[PDB]
C-alpha cells in the first residue's frame, strides 16, 4: 500500500522527478491540517460499533426483502456475515481517511469483492444503499452535526475532509456496481 505522501512519490517517480518546491506546498498544507485528520477519524472509530448497527438495521427498515424466508439476511449466520462485512468496509474507509489516499481501498478490500458478491447472489442495490447510509453517518460525525452526539472538539472548518470521506464511499459504491 501507499499513503497520501507516497502518492506524490509515484506521481513524481514516473516523470523521473525530484519533489520540487511547488509540490511540497501540497504536503505542507496536508500536515497543517494533520491535527484535524487525526481529530476526524477519532470521531468515527469512537462511534463505529453503533454505526454499523445504525446502518444495516436501517436497510431492513428501508426494505423488507432481505428478511424474506430464503432472503439474504434470513440466516443468523448470513445476518452476522452482513454485520461482518459491513464493518470491514467501515474499517477500510477509516484506514483510507487517516492515510489521506484510497491506496489501501482498491487492493486490500475491493479486489474481487464484486464478483464474490455476484457468486452468492448478494443484492447489490441494497449494498449501494448500505454503503451510502454510512456516508450519511460519516459526514455528520466529521462535522459534529450528528443529532444525538455533540462531541468535545475544537472549532474550525472541516468541510473538505467531509467531502474526502464522501469521495471514498462512492469509490466503494462504484466497484460494487
Amino acid at each position: 500500500m501507499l499513503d497520501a505522501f507516497s502518492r506524490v512519490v509515484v506521481n513524481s517517480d514516473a516523470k523521473a522527478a525530484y519533489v520540487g518546491g511547488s509540490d511540497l506546498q501540497a504536503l505542507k498544507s496536508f500536515i497543517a491540517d494533520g491535527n484535524k485528520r487525526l481529530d476526524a477519524v477519532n470521531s468515527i472509530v469512537s462511534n463505529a460499533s453503533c454505526m454499523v448497527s445504525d446502518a444495516v438495521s436501517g436497510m431492513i427498515c428501508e426494505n423488507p426483502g432481505l428478511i424474506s424466508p430464503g432472503g439474504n439476511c434470513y440466516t443468523n449466520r448470513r445476518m452476522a456475515a452482513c454485520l461482518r462485512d459491513g464493518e470491514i468496509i467501515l474499517r477500510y474507509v477509516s484506514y483510507a481517511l487517516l492515510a489521506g489516499d484510497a491506496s489501501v481501498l482498491e487492493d486490500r478490500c475491493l479486489n474481487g469483492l464484486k464478483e464474490t458478491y455476484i457468486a452468492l447472489g448478494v443484492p447489490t442495490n441494497s449494498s449501494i444503499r448500505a454503503v451510502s447510509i454510512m456516508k450519511a453517518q460519516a459526514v455528520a460525525f466529521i462535522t459534529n452535526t450528528a443529532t444525538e452526539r455533540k462531541m468535545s472538539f475544537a472549532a474550525g472548518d472541516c468541510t473538505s475532509l467531509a467531502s474526502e470521506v464522501a469521495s471514498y464511499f462512492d469509490r466503494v459504491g462504484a466497484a460494487i456496481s
Binding site: 505522501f5 507516497s6 512519490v9 525530484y18 519533489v19 520540487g20 511540497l24 492515510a99
Partner: protein, 164 residues
Amino acid sequence: MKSVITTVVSAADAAGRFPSNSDLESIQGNIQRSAARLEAAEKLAGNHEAVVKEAGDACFAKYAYLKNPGEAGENQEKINKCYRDVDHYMRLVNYCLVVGGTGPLDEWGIAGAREVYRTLNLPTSAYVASIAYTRDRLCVPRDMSAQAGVEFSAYLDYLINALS
C-alpha cells in the same frame, strides 16, 4: 513502502483492529519530525545536479582501477551509466525524506541489489564510497538545519548498511 502510516495501519489490519489512540499517536510524531526532513527535501531537490557531480568523480578518485579495460567503468559510456545510478540513489533518498520511512529505498533500490551487482560484476564498495563522500560533507548549519542534517545522514547510512 514503509512510512509512519503504512506500518501502523498494517498492524491494525493484521490484527483486524481499528485505528485507536496507540495508532494515532504515531502520526503526531510525523508532524513534528516531518518539518525537519521536509526542510532537507527541496534543498536536495533543487541541488541534486551538483551533488551527483561531486559524488560521481569521488567514486573514481578513490578507485582508479575501474577505468581499466574489463572492469565497470571501462569506457566513457558505462561511466555515464554509473552517474545515473548515483542520480537514482540520490532520488530514492529524496523520496525517503518525504515519506518518513525507508520505503523507496527498500522497495526500489535495496531489494535485489545484492544479486545484480554481483551478477553484472559491479563492485559494491564503489557504491558505498560514492554515498559516503556526500555524507561527511554536510557542514550541518550551511546545507540544512541541524535537525535536517541528522535526518538526511540517517538515510544515507541505510544505503551504506544495506549494501554491506
